[PDB]
Each structure stands twice: as C-alpha cells, then as structure tokens.
Amino acid sequence: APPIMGSSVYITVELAIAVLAILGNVLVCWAVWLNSNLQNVTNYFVVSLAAADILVGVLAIPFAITISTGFCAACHGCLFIACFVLVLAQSSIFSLLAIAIDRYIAIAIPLRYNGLVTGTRAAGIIAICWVLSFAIGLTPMLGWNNCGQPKEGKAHSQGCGEGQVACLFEDVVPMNYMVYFNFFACVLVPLLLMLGVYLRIFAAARRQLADLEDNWETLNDNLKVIEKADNAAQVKDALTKMRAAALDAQKKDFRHGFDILVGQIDDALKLANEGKVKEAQAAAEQLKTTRNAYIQKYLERARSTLQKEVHAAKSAAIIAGLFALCWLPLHIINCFTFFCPDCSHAPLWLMYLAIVLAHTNSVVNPFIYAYRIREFRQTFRKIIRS
Numbered sequence: 510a511p512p513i514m515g516s517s518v519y520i521t522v523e524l525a526i527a528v529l530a531i532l533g534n535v536l537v538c539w540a541v542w543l544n545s546n547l548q549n550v551t552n553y554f555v556v557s558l559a560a561a562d563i564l565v566g567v568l569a570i571p572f573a574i575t576i577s578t579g580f581c582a583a584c585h586g587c588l589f590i591a592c593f594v595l596v597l598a599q600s601s602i603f604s605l606l607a608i609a610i611d612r613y614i615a616i617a618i619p620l621r622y623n624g625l626v627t628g629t630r631a632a633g634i635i636a637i638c639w640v641l642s643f644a645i646g647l648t649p650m651l652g653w654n655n656c657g658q659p660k661e662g663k664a665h666s667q668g669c670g671e672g673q674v675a676c677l678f679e680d681v682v683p684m685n686y687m688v689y690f691n692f693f694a695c696v697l698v699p700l701l702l703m704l705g706v707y708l709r710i711f712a713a714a715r716r717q718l719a720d721l722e723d724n725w726e727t728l729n730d731n732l733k734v735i736e737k738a739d740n741a742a743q744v745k746d747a748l749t750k751m752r753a754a755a756l757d758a759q760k761k762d763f764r765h766g767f768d769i770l771v772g773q774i775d776d777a778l779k780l781a782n783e784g785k786v787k788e789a790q791a792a793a794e795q796l797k798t799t800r801n802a803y804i805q806k807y808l809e810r811a812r813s814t815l816q817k818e819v820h821a822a823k824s825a826a827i828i829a830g831l832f833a834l835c836w837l838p839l840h841i842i843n844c845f846t847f848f849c850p851d852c853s854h855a856p857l858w859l860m861y862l863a864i865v866l867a868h869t870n871s872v873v874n875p876f877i878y879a880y881r882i883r884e885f886r887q888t889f890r891k892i893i894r895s
C-alpha cells in the first residue's frame with residue numbers, strides 16, 4: 510500500500526488533537542483572566558500548564574507531522590524541531606510538581622501558607638522552570654547528538670544536499686539521552702516524587718480528621734464521667750482532660766465559642782477543688798448547651814474545609830496520573846529500542862498510536878477542571894453563553 514494513505518489517518522488525527530488542544534486550554538486561560546476567585550497561586554501553575562498545552566497544538570503537533578515526512582534538512586534544524594516537544598514536556602513536569610507542593614503546603618501549615626507563598630514569588634518560579642525546561646529539552650543541541658555520524662545512504666536516497674539529512678527522530682536524538690537523561694532522571698524521578706508528595710498529603714489530611722473525632726470523643730466521654738462520678742476528685746480528672754482537649758481543638762464566632770466552653774470548665778473546676786461535688790456536676794451540665802451551639806459548628810466547619818482540600822488534591826493528582834499514563838508507552842518503546850537490540854523495532858502503526866496518545870494529554874486537562882472544580886465549571890458556562 511502507498512505510505513501516504515496510512516499517513517493520511519495520522520495527520521488528520523494529529524490536527525484534530527491540535528484543534529482541541531488550542532480551544533480547550535485557551536478557554537482555561539480566559540476563565541482565569543475573568544474570574545477573581547480563580548486568581549491565586551495554584552491556578553497560576555494551572556495556566557503555566559495550559560500554556561505548554563497550547564504550544565503543543567501550535568508548534569509541537571505541526572513539528573511532529575513534518576518529521577513524519579523525513580524531509581531534507583540540516584542536522585541541527587532537524588534537531589530543534591525534534592527536541593522542542595521535550596521542552597514542553599519538561600515544562601509540564603515542573604508545573605505538576607509545583608501544584609503538588611502547593612497543595613502540600615496548604616494542608617500541612619495552613620496558618621503559614623499566606624506568609625510563605627505569594628503572587629510575585631510564584632511568577633518567578635514559573636520563569637525559572639521554563640528556562641530550565643528549555644535547557645533540559647535542548648541538551649542535544651549543545652553537542653549530544655548524532656550529527657557527527659549521519660545516515661548518508663538514507664540522505665542520498667531522498668537526494669538531500671551536502672550537510673542535509675533525512676529528518677527522523679531516532680536518527681538525530683541519541684537513545685541514551687532519551688532513556689537515562691530524559692526518561693529516568695528528568696521524567697521518572699519527578700513523577701516518583703509527586704507520588705510521595707501526594708502520599709503525605711492524603712496521610713496528613715486523614716490524621717487531622719483521627720484528631721478531630723478524638724477531641725470530640727474526649728469532650729463527650731468525660732461528660733458521662735461527671736454524670737456518674739462519686740467524689741470531687743473524679744470530676745477533676747474528667748474536667749482536666751476536657752480542658753486540655755478544648756485548648757487542643759482550637760489550634761470572632763470561633764473565639765467566643767471556646768470563651769464560654771473553657772470558662773464553664775473553670776467554673777466547675779474550681780468547685781471541684783473546693784470539694785463541692787454536686788455543684789460541680791451541675792456546672793458541667795451547662796457545657797452541653799454550649800456544645801450544641803458553638804462546638805458542633807466548628808467540629809462541622811473543620812470537616813467541611815478539610816474535605817474540600819482533599820477534593821482539590823484528588824483533582825490535582827488525576828492530572829499527574831493522566832500525564833503518566835499518556836507518556837509512558839512512548840517512553841517504554843524507547844526503552845525497548847535502546848536496551849533490546851535483538852528485539853524487532855516497534856512497528857510504524859504503534860509508533861503513530863504512541864505519539865497521538867502522548868499528544869492527547871493536552872486535551873484531557875480542561876475536561877478534568879470542569880468535571881471536578883465547581884468554580885471552573887461555572888466560569889466556562891458564562892464564556893460559552895456570551
């Protein structure tokens with residue numbers, strides 16, 4: 510069969526992916542521009558993400574079509590178009606790694622997040638990552654290439670001039686760079702780091718919740734210790750454990766709630782040190798009405814805020830998971846080409862399937878924000894309507 514027929518399916522799919530990559534991610538950046546709520550440090554890395562995704566459809570996908578033809582070109586010119594996609598991939602890894610750290614800081618030290626990260630500090634980090642993304646992605650340009658040993662038989666076959674080579678990815682980019690330098694160090698290592706970061710995120714989130722239910726049980730169980738106590742000392746051991754638990758749960762409406770609770774504990778605590786048993790048991794009963802009007806409000810506002818931060822971390826973890834699933838097949842084919850010389854090279858239909866699968870990651874991101882983030886979903890509607 511003619512080669513152009515099989516190539517017609519590939520180019521059409523490649524362009525279809527490019528259209529969805531530009532439209533979807535432009536819609537994300539326009540939503541962040543309009544909405545005031547969507548303007549925060551976490552979303553700036555989201556825009557830095559969608560920035561690279563647009564550049565895939567505008568440059569990387571057109572580049573990938575041009576390489577598929579094997580057109581004649583100078584080895585370094587062919588080297589830039591083949592390595593530019595490596596810059597955008599490294600940009601996305603740094604962005605995804607920044608989001609995981611951001612969500613880790615917000616859940617580990619909530620009362621220090623606003624003092625730690627700001628807008629201007631985040632904007633600088635984006636610049637540093639993008640500069641490093643060019644450096645890593647264009648390392649073969651600095652001399653780690655196969656230009657010194659060009660395929661001459663393939664060049665004269667298509668009648669390339671002197672200094673020109675048949676432009677193909679595996680022909681100009683060394684596989685050791687792609688396996689050791691690119692895959693292992695630059696791709697696999699940061700991906701494993703995100704897995705560890707997200708593991709600590711979900712660990713620290715649930716541990717604060719046995720903490721929330723533990724203080725709630727320390728407050729409830731010791732009330733029944735006072736209700737059936739015999740002596741003045743037994744009420745003291747129950748009130749002192751509640752007083753420490755009351756001070757542990759807090760760390761205007763929030764402050765005044767404990768002002769009545771901890772105060773009423775001292776009202777009964779002083780009556781216990783005097784020896785008055787019955788008057789202490791009555792003063793402790795006042796704590797129940799204070800519990801149903803202030804404490805249970807904070808038990809359930811804390812549970813609500815922690816659940817919304819876990820929902821945000823789950824949504825961000827999906828973006829990293831979809832990045833790993835989309836790119837790994839294209840990387841493992843590089844591992845087979847490099848490590849196993851006895852193996853027959855992966856067929857052309859599979860190579861086409863792996864490339865488009867790596868490109869699909871540009872489209873999948875805006876669908877996740879709409880399905881998982883409520884603020885993004887509402888903002889998309891008003892841009893579509895008008």
Ligand SMILES: CC(C)CCC[C@@H](C)[C@H]1CC[C@H]2[C@@H]3CC=C4C[C@@H](O)CC[C@]4(C)[C@H]3CC[C@]12C
Binds near residue numbers: 585586
């Ligand atoms: C953002 C866009 C519009 C800016 C332009 C970038 C593109 C289109 C330009 C800049 C560098 C150019 C490469 C310059 C070097 C060569 C070597 C030659 O044998 C074939 C063309 C080729 C490979 C050019 C491809 C087009 C190229 C990649």
Ligand SMILES: CC(C)CCC[C@@H](C)[C@H]1CC[C@H]2[C@@H]3CC=C4C[C@@H](O)CC[C@]4(C)[C@H]3CC[C@]12C
Binds near residue numbers: 841844845
């Ligand atoms: C998430 C991480 C750990 C993924 C691991 C990918 C790498 C390390 C593993 C999984 C599949 C492995 C390939 C399994 C098959 C072979 C065939 C053999 O002749 C050489 C090694 C080689 C080619 C392995 C390379 C390493 C490989 C690519």
Ligand SMILES: CC(C)CCC[C@@H](C)[C@H]1CC[C@H]2[C@@H]3CC=C4C[C@@H](O)CC[C@]4(C)[C@H]3CC[C@]12C
Binds near residue numbers: 834837853854
């Ligand atoms: C991590 C998940 C997404 C797994 C994806 C499956 C990929 C990486 C595995 C499964 C089947 C594998 C193919 C197994 C058989 C061949 C033919 C051989 O001559 C070279 C390797 C090659 C082409 C393997 C490529 C990698 C391959 C496509």
Ligand SMILES: CC(C)(C)CC(=O)Nc1c(F)cc(C(=O)Nc2nccs2)cc1F
Binds near residue numbers: 577839
């Ligand atoms: C289809 C050909 C063989 C006739 C031309 C060609 O070589 N196409 C091609 C391409 F445009 C990009 C890549 C690529 O990006 N590979 C990566 N592996 C890890 C990160 S990126 C691989 C390719 F084979």
Ligand SMILES: CCCCCCCC/C=C\CCCCCCCC(=O)O
Binds near residue numbers: 531578
């Ligand atoms: C912005 C969305 C995508 C539309 C942009 C147009 C994409 C054009 C596709 C490929 C451009 C290059 C085609 C191949 C050029 C080399 C041909 C040759 O020299 O034989």
Ligand code: NA
Binds near residue numbers: 561562597598601870
């Ligand atoms: Na991407």
